[PDB]
UniProtKB/Swiss-Prot annotation:
This is Platelet-activating factor acetylhydrolase IB subunit alpha1. It is found in: Cytoplasm. It is an enzyme of class 3 (hydrolase). Keywords: Acetylation, Cytoplasm, Hydrolase, Lipid degradation, Lipid metabolism, Phosphoprotein. It comes from Bos taurus. The lineage of its organism: Eukaryota, Metazoa, Chordata, Craniata, Vertebrata. Belongs to the 'GDSL' lipolytic enzyme family. Platelet-activating factor acetylhydrolase IB beta/gamma subunits subfamily. One of its GO terms (molecular function) is protein homodimerization activity. It catalyses: a 1-O-alkyl-2-acetyl-sn-glycero-3-phosphocholine + H2O = a 1-O-alkyl-sn-glycero-3-phosphocholine + acetate + H(+); 1-O-hexadecyl-2-acetyl-sn-glycero-3-phosphocholine + H2O = 1-O-hexadecyl-sn-glycero-3-phosphocholine + acetate + H(+); 1-O-hexadecyl-2-acetyl-sn-glycero-3-phosphate + H2O = 1-O-hexadecyl-sn-glycero-3-phosphate + acetate + H(+).
């Protein structure tokens, strides 16, 4: 198997069960709410909710945010199969995962992303699926930049022929001419500051408004 597309939960090796607590909260959310849009993915999705761009741009859309820090594609796949898509009928599902898939080749990660789109197409066939490109990372040029770039190419190629599947590259150009990423945009060269989220969320919001 491709480990990126084999659904599996995160095993708790620390002891406080926080991952499973989050999953259960999201399952409860889906059970009790009627979102038009659901966002699912890793910390880039999760921390988008810690506003203050979420309330102005995405709350009005009737959205649920199921981002979980540290998740790889297989974790998101498992969550979608194990309750987070139940009791809802969203118009759009936004997917943003793959940067945490350490140990998986770019091809494998792409396979994971395609599995997530397929699952969504099966369980929520009426929904359009938006997949965000993986952002660059690291202060200077490094292998993860090339990897994430390659994933984006392969995913873009994969979704090109997909009527209601949309690939969005939300990168406004975080990697500068000198090859650096500014801590003003990504405070730790991975997670986005408020300043970093602005153009990303702006790009997403526009697309969501078209589709909607």
């Amino acid at each position: 198997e491709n480990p990126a597309s084999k659904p599996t939960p995160v095993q708790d090796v620390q002891g406080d069960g926080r991952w499973m607590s989050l999953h259960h909260r999201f399952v409860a959310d889906s059970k009790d709410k009627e979102p038009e849009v659901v966002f699912i993915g890793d910390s880039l999705v999760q921390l988008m909710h810690q506003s203050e761009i979420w309330r102005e741009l995405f709350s009005p859309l009737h959205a649920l945010n199921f981002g979980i820090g540290g998740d790889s594609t297989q974790h998101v796949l498992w969550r979608l199969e194990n309750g987070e898509l139940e009791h809802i009928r969203p118009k759009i599902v936004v997917v943003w995962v793959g940067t945490n898939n350490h140990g998986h080749t770019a091809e494998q990660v792409t396979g994971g992303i395609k599995a997530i789109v397929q699952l969504v197409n099966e369980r929520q066939p009426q929904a359009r699926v938006v997949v965000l490109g993986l952002l660059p990372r690291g202060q200077h040029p490094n292998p993860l930049r090339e990897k994430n770039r390659r994933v984006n190419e392969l995913v873009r190629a994969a979704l090109a022929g997909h009527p209601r599947a949309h690939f969005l590259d939300a990168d406004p150009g975080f990697v500068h001419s000198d090859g650096t990423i500014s801590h003003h945009d990504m405070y730790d060269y991975l997670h986005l500051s408020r300043l970093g989220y602005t153009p990303v969320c702006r790009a997403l919001h526009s697309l969501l408004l078209r589709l909607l």
